């Protein structure tokens, strides 16, 4: 009985919601709020704890990009602070390898990061690893075959169709085949040994196209597009299916949750968030 | 100074 | 009958509006939208054509600083692109001398410019001229006695009360007396041979004070404050009075338009914009 958690996000300002969808019975749980509202954050689960990483806070006094790492324990319904990252990272990407959290890219004000750092829960500390080849914010991150892939994003002057792959044992990055489409703020995840990149912003419009990467053929292939165009969408995989949550379609902040079935190659809408929003962190546990 | 988010 | 034109601005995101106010009969016209929304731009008129210069498109998808020069023809209700500036300039200041447009300061990413460039409509060409002595964004620009004054702003570290003066024939800049107040994002204009600086942000508060510079005595003098504190306001002079449009007061995007009568030294509220906004460009033709 694993739940899809969605944390934070953006609707007229950074949000503090933590809510959880149960795909088996279709209900939403309202859990304890983030202590600090943030949009542009990422979520992930390690050892049954939920982590909320990075992002951006809007407050009466001004805007603050976040270096925070916060931990939610579903047993106690309580958030606790963990050690903060070396730098603030808004529009961060995150992936998990061997119980370690990788924070990749993101921005601090006008600074567009190529640095990457690694968190070890057992010691509660962060260490920098090798930096990416490209500065990327709005980057999608996916973990496959114990490698970390960073897909698309914005390097500070151009929105990117490029992607690169990180080798944890060698501690190095190598560029891989570029996507068919430029995308920043896409949903990127792994399903059935393929990397999917859904939606995003190509510099002109929000996108509803979806493409997937096969690591052995080294080619990106379009699959069925989503019903709604969306950028800054949340994404995760639950029981063989991709779920995309929220995002911005150019006019509205979506509450739509769509579900992709790879067997049938079709998207269907499965629920609505309790309110429309973009820029959420999403994880499953 | 500008109110932008 | 000349109109007060207001272009672009920001409310939830950068805007595309072009609207014109007729002060003699109190009406607002809705004209053709800008091709690309922007806030932090500047407006001016040369030869009956309206120009929109610089700014930044801040959208929920991300931000893009602008180097664009766009030309609006009131006879055709059509925008046309002109040659772009050498660099993007967000929160630019502009002044016109002898039919040439000077673009001063502004930001591009981390860069706070001191460079200055001049546009010649007859050739559709930009050329750099001497740079200012200080980097300034959010700077107010005024033209008086065929000299160009750059007033206040933000140098990348501190907000400024300094001001300086450009000599087109000699192509050089000189500091002049500093204002009584630090002001970034003030409205600056020329009325009856004086330079006025209204509103802005002093580092702690949005301002409602107004001060004016007499070039012969070289002193700045407060006049009557505006009714509403405001920063990133639009400003222009029409039939011997100063009009200030919109702005941010720390909590609200203003729709208030106030009008200064130098004869009685009083401000009155004259109209409201169709919706509140900050960072407009404004001009009269
Ligand atoms: Na922080
Ligand atoms: Na590879
Ligand atoms: Na985006
Ligand atoms: Na700005
Ligand atoms: Na915004
Ligand atoms: Na540049
Ligand atoms: Na600079």
Author numbering:
A (entry chain A), C (entry chain B): 325 to 609
B (entry chain D): 3 to 7
Quote the authors verbatim.
Increasing the activity of the transcription factor Nrf2 is an inducible cellular response to a range of inputs including redox and electrophilic stress and various intracellular stimuli. The main negative regulators of Nrf2 activity are the proteins Keap1 and β‐TrCP, which target Nrf2 for ubiquitination and proteosomal degradation by interacting with degrons in the Neh2 and Neh6 domains of Nrf2, respectively. Inhibition of the direct protein–protein interaction (PPI) between Keap1 and Nrf2 has been proposed as an intervention that can increase Nrf2 transcriptional activity by stalling its ubiquitination and turnover in the cell, thus prolonging its half‐life.4 Recently, several approaches to inhibition of the PPI between the C‐terminal Keap1 Kelch domain and the Neh2 domain of Nrf2 have been described. In this manuscript we describe some of our recent work in characterising the binding behaviour of short (heptameric) Keap1‐interactive peptides by X‐ray crystallography and in exploring the SAR of analogues that incorporate unnatural amino acids.
We and others have found that peptides based upon the high‐affinity Nrf2 ETGE sequence have proved to be the most active in Keap1 binding assays, and hybrid sequences based upon the ETGE/p62 consensus sequences, such as 5, have provided the best short (heptamer) interacting sequences. We soaked human Keap1 Kelch domain crystals with peptides 1 and 5 to determine their bound conformations, with the aim of observing the effect of shortening the N and C termini on the conformation of the peptide. In each case the peptide occupied the binding pocket of one of the two Keap1 proteins in the unit cell and entered into interactions with the vacant Keap1 Kelch domain through polar interactions between the C‐terminal carboxylate group of the peptide and Arg380 of the adjacent protein. Otherwise, the peptide are oriented in a similar manner to the previously described ETGE 16‐mer peptide23a, with the exception of the Asp side chain being positioned differently due to rotation about the Cα−CO bond. Peptide 1 is involved in electrostatic and/or hydrogen‐bond interactions with Arg380, Asn382, Arg483, Gln530, Tyr525, and Ser602, whereas peptide 5 has an additional interaction with Arg415, but lacks the glutamate side chain that interacts with Tyr525. Peptide 5 shows a tighter interaction with Keap1, probably due to the conformational restriction introduced by the Glu>Pro substitution, which restricts the mobility of the peptide backbone. Analysis of the thermodynamic profile of the interaction demonstrated a binding event that is enthalpy‐driven (ΔH), with a small entropic (TΔS) penalty, possibly reflecting the stabilisation of the β‐hairpin conformation of the peptide by the proline residue.
